[PDB]
């Protein structure tokens, strides 16, 4: 049920993205912390237990609403992880993903009727995920996972270093 030994796969994911430790600006309005996240990924399966995968993630744009100051933060990146899986049944796997993300985060803020700025930064963060994967056909599988990414930013540059959690459904095709 894990992809056959020495096989390639490609897939995509959609998810509920939520940022945490979101300190940035002292805005007096709401912040919309739940956002659509998305990504593409591809990988290679070594054996039923071990695979490696790379992907791009869009982590979503968080608005900071307010009438004193308002702004936004967004992040995205490229990740590389090892996937370690246990065949809990002969058709369902449970897995963890371990590795890192090269990320770009962008911020903006403005004062209503006044000044504004845009900034961005780049850096590297650890990625951990856990999930289950079900093989629908020998070619198609679906994933449900939670992906945690730490310190997406720098408080000395863009002014925030939030964490991201993302629950996602993914689908992949296997080139067996």
């Amino acid at each position, epitope marked *: 049920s894990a992809p056959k030994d020495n096989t390639w796969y490609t897939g995509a994911k959609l998810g509920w993205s939520q940022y945490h430790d979101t300190g940035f*600006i*002292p805005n007096n309005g709401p912040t919309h912390e739940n956002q659509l996240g998305a990504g593409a990924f591809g990988g290679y399966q070594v054996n039923p237990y071990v695979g490696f995968e790379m992907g791009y993630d869009w982590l979503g744009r968080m608005p900071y609403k307010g009438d*004193n100051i308002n702004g936004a933060y967004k992040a995205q990146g490229v990740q590389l992880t090892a996937k370690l899986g246990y065949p809990i049944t002969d058709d369902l796997d449970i897995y963890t993903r371990l590795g890192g993300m090269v990320w770009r985060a962008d911020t903006k*803020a403005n*004062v209503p009727g*006044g000044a504004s*700025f845009k*900034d961005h930064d780049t850096g590297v963060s650890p990625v951990f995920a856990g999930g289950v994967e079900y093989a629908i056909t020998p070619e198609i599988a679906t994933r449900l996972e939670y992906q945690w990414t730490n310190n997406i930013g720098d*408080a000395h540059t863009i*002014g925030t270093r939030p964490d991201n959690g993302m629950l996602s459904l993914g689908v992949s095709y296997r080139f067996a």
Partner: nanobody
Amino acid sequence: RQLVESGGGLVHTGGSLKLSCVPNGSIFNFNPMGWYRQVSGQQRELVATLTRDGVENYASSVKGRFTISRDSAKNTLYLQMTDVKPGDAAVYICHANYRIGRNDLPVWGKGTPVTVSA
């Protein structure tokens, strides 16, 4: 409508005044806060500033005559002017800087007029 100033008008030479400015949201959202002064079409002169940690700085033209302060329970920044010279008449303007990592984001008020008699 972010920084709102009050309390200018006429003062006599050698007299005294208190200006006040209340910000949208909280003092301590900013570092520093300050006062500037402008005569019609001349540059904004920095008058005084006050850091989040409460350190105070002054222009040499007002040092020892004016004093900068706040009251957190009032949410108010004050300029106390004493020993007013005729060279201190201006529109006095409240300033407030948001410090967002490496980025500085300034806020300015319309200002309040101060006029001086001999």
